[PDB]
Amino acid sequence: MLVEQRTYWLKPGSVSTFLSLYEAEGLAIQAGALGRLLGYYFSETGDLNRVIQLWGFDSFEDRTRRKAILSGNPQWKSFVGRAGSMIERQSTELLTPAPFSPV
Amino acid sequence: MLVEQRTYWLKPGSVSTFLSLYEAEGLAIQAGALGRLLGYYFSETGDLNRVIQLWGFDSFEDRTRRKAILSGNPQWKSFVGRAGSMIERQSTELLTPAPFSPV
Amino acid sequence: MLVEQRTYWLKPGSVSTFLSLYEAEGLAIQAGALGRLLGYYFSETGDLNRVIQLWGFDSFEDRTRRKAILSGNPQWKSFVGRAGSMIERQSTELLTPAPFSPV
Amino acid sequence: MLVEQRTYWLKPGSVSTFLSLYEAEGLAIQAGALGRLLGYYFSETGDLNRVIQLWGFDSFEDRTRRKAILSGNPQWKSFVGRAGSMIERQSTELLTPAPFSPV
Amino acid sequence: MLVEQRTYWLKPGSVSTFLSLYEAEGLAIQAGALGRLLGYYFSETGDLNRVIQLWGFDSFEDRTRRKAILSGNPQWKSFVGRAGSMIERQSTELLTPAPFSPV
Amino acid sequence: MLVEQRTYWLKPGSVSTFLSLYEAEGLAIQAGALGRLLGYYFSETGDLNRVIQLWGFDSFEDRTRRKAILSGNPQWKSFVGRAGSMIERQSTELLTPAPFSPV
Amino acid sequence: MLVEQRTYWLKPGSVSTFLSLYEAEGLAIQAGALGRLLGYYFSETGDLNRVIQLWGFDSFEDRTRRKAILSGNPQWKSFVGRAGSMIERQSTELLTPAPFSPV
Amino acid sequence: MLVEQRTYWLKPGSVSTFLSLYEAEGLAIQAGALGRLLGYYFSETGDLNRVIQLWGFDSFEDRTRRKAILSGNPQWKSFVGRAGSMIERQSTELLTPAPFSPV
């Protein structure tokens, strides 16, 4: 499995608004396209106002395919338009599970 | 649930040695004491030679209790002695799951 | 005791405005809810325009309780609305006093 | 008052050894020379293996005077020789208390 | 050869808009003035929303000459006016090829 | 001598506008109040859009006195109002000359 | 094409030794396994003692295949043993060429 | 004029030893080769154990020429051998003086 850990830095104070809007308008579309949500968090220490998500993919090739499916989805584009102004900065990294890592 | 994400930066080239030694000598003790391993990874992008672990705790109080149980374990101390020289730097952060985050 | 050190990065030039507004409208509410202010500073070196605060808590559980009391306070919400635009970024960390640390 | 916040990054695993050695051999000398210890902590989040100290001075001039008194103390030099190998990196910053900050 | 690696951090979501506008209105002018484009990329990991460019110059003196030619070009100024609002931050570094580096 | 090195990060593209406005409206006032300008630069590598200034002071006490004189100057306040929107972030550090450092 | 940009931070002063040893003992093996070297540089500004390499791959899957071929090569392992002590830290990132990027 | 600002991070506690050794064995050679020392400092805030130097050059081409003269000097090589172990990390940046910057 290929694991992606994405971090968004949000405008101060906007985490609860973002998470509510995402759950109502973005989660079903994004999880439907990408396939395996492993975790979706907000920070309590370090930089505040971060939302951190982990996604599992069969391969980099499949991640590419699923991300393009999501990016072209008209309902996703609408949600990105409504939620995007809360996002100040985005980063991502690719991780490999150790053999004993769960699931 | 309270989620802890810990990062260790290891000496260059030492990730596979660390993961093999940990699986053989540290995993059963640490998972037994701490309770819920959510993920154990090594990095493929960004800073290389990172190992990243996520642990789930019922509360901060229980994390404190379980960490002291682990730190006082004589077999854990032995493993830390054998593996510790590979660790150059350590960081950790506390995270809260969004309501829709899995498990 | 559990010690929290919070840092806010403010818009350039806004420190004195923030501190005056906080002292007049936020301090009594926040200190009343959280309990033990250990220090409230602004930076003279490093990143300028930082305000740095240290708070002492009996436990993480009590910090959680007191923070929710503060966040739900209608007068606090009003102050956050008036002061919040000065805040560009927020971070926090948890610290433990050494046995010989004062108070 | 002028407040100094110093951070030392220690070798992984060495915090308890450093704090024990400092309390036994360095604290009385350093506090005697510098005058007002405001806090002495170790980190629980963020970079682990940090020790963080806050000192209060009447003025920068007096800080300079007291630091030179400490640096020239033969017993301090001995302690620095015994404890210094645990220190990997050091940083410091100067802070000013807000008018309502305690003490 | 002197190699310059420039990084622009763009507003979230704006990479494809920037690259399309640059290719249509800026590339021919900039490549014409500067001389040797070695690579023009956007990031897939790390900080997202980065565009990274590498340029090769005969010398620092020639880089200075060509950059002033570009900066004074009225069509370049127009493009910078239309594209500039997408750029949040800029950095650059100078690199020297190893003897075996290609071209 | 006590040396202060200040860095301002400016809005992309604004360095020449800032330097022209400062030279016309701020330099004589600021240099008159602070006393010894050692250098005033803009960056060519690293973070672009930085302006970096070095000031020499007889002592920290005199720096404090001169900075308050400048901050209270009505013409300085006017210039800060006109130039301030170009400044995104500010940092500063204190340095000590080596014995052989010039002047 | 998928582009990888790798950075190694070397022990101060060791860049020329590393590059000479690599050219003599590592380049033919590594380029033979990985396929397309796009650039191999050392830094002149920013962090000194960096070596920066860019590699082009048909796909992430092919990068994975070629990296495992290289890692299992006995002559590569020997070179890594002889050169590795110069490497203090390693990072990498994945990049996508813009449509107009050369080659 | 082209200005170079170099920073060395030294082993904790070694600044005074480095500066004494440099003044006795390196300064005359280095200043003789490079031409115009503008400042040589150690840090009092921020990262401690930094030495920061500013050098002025007629041009980048002349900086290149003078640096190669210095690097090939047998007495410089000897000094670098004796002082080099104190240096943990090195960085540099190029700066341009504003028109009103002194000298």
SS (H, E, C) C2-36: EEEEEEEEECCCCHHHHHHHHHHHCHHHHHHHHCC
Contact assignment for H40 to F98 by CB distance below 8 Å:
yes
Chains that contact B by 3+ CB pairs under 8 Å? Answer: A, C, D, E, G
Tell me which residue range forms the domain holding G14. Answer: 1-103
H67: its two tokens: 């640096």
Q: Which long-range contacts (CB under 8 A, 24 or more apart) does H63-70 make?
A: H63/H2, H63/H4, H63/H34, H66/H33, H66/H34, H66/H35, H67/H33, H67/H34, H69/H33, H70/H29, H70/H30, H70/H33, H70/H34
Say how many CA atoms lie within 13 Å of A31 toward its Cβ. Answer: 17
Alpha-carbon distance of G20 to A81, in angstroms, equals 52
Asked if A71 has any chain E CB less than 8 Å from its own CB, the reply is: no
Chains that contact E by 3+ CB pairs under 8 Å? Answer: A, B, F, G, H
Asked if H47 has any chain C CB less than 8 Å from its own CB, the reply is: no
Residue C96 · residue C3 · CB < 8 Å: yes
Residue G75 · residue G29 · CB < 8 Å: yes
* A25: helix, strand or coil: helix
Secondary structure (H, E, C), chain B: CEEEEEEEEECCCCHHHHHHHHHHHCHHHHHHHHCCEEEEEEECCEECCEEEEEEEECCHHHHHHHHHHHHCCHHHHHHHHHHHHHEEEEEEEEEEECCCCCC
Interface mutation vs chain F, best among C10, C16, C48, most F CBs within 10 Å: C48
Alpha-carbon distance of F101 to H38, in angstroms, equals 8
Chains that contact A by 3+ CB pairs under 8 Å? Answer: B, C, D, E, G
Asked if H1 has any chain D CB less than 8 Å from its own CB, the reply is: no
Asked if H88 has any chain G CB less than 8 Å from its own CB, the reply is: yes
Contact assignment for C23 to D102 by CB distance below 8 Å:
no
Residue D56 · residue D1 · CB < 8 Å: yes
F53: its two tokens: 């200034």
Residue D50 · residue D6 · CB < 8 Å: no
Alpha-carbon distance of D34 to D69, in angstroms, equals 9
Alpha-carbon distance of B37 to A38, in angstroms, equals 13
Alpha-carbon distance of D100 to D102, in angstroms, equals 6
Asked if H90 has any chain F CB less than 8 Å from its own CB, the reply is: no
Domain count along chain A: 1
User: Least CB-CB distance to A93: which of E12, E13, E45?
Assistant: E45
Handedness of CA A63, A68, A74, A76 (dihedral sign): positive
Residue H38 · residue H102 · CB < 8 Å: no
Q: How far is CA G24 from the centre of its chain?
A: 15
Residue C98 · residue D23 · CB < 8 Å: yes
Cα of C45 to nearest chain H Cα, Å: 7
Alpha-carbon distance of G83 to H9, in angstroms, equals 24
Contact assignment for D84 to H12 by CB distance below 8 Å:
yes
Q: Which long-range contacts (CB under 8 A, 24 or more apart) does H76-83 make?
A: H76/H26, H76/H29, H76/H30, H76/H33, H78/H25, H79/H21, H79/H22, H79/H25, H79/H26, H79/H29, H80/G13, H82/H21, H82/H25, H83/H18, H83/H21, H83/H22, H83/H25, H83/H26
Cα of D74 to nearest chain C Cα, Å: 23
G77-G78-G82-G84 Cα dihedral, nearest 10 degrees: 0
From D49, C61, F87, C83, select the one nearest B65 (Cα to Cα): C61
* Cβ–Cβ pairs < 8 A, chains A and G: 9
Chains that contact D by 3+ CB pairs under 8 Å? Answer: A, B, C, F, H
H101: its two tokens: 């910057």
Asked if E45 has any chain B CB less than 8 Å from its own CB, the reply is: yes
Residues in chain H within 8 Å Cβ distance of E60: 59-61
Kind and range of the H or E run holding G80: helix G74-83
Asked if G60 has any chain A CB less than 8 Å from its own CB, the reply is: yes
Judged by 3 or more CB pairs under 8 A, whether G touches B is yes
What CATH number is associated with residue F8? 3.30.70.100
A44-A50-A51-A55 Cα dihedral, nearest 10 degrees: -100
Asked if H13 has any chain D CB less than 8 Å from its own CB, the reply is: yes
Asked if G46 has any chain F CB less than 8 Å from its own CB, the reply is: yes
Determination technique for this PDB entry?
Answer: X-ray
Burial class (CB in 10 A: 0-12, 13-18, 19+), F57: buried
C16: its two tokens: 């004195």
For tokens 């996604």, the residue is A55
Judged by 3 or more CB pairs under 8 A, whether E touches H is yes
DSSP letter at C44 equals S
H76: its two tokens: 């410089």
Resolution of the coordinates, Å: 1.6
User: Least CB-CB distance to B84: which of D13, D44, D45?
Assistant: D13
Cα of F59 to nearest chain D Cα, Å: 8
F63: its two tokens: 């720096």
Q: CA of H2: which chain F residue's CA is closest? A: F44
Cα of F52 to nearest chain G Cα, Å: 16
D89: its two tokens: 């990196």
Alpha-carbon distance of E80 to C74, in angstroms, equals 47
User: Least CB-CB distance to C92: which of A12, A13, A48?
Assistant: A48
For tokens 């590569």, the residue is G76
Alpha-carbon distance of D89 to H49, in angstroms, equals 8
Burial class (CB in 10 A: 0-12, 13-18, 19+), A16: exposed
DSSP letter at H102 equals -
Asked if E16 has any chain G CB less than 8 Å from its own CB, the reply is: no
Contact assignment for B91 to D13 by CB distance below 8 Å:
no
Asked if E21 has any chain G CB less than 8 Å from its own CB, the reply is: no
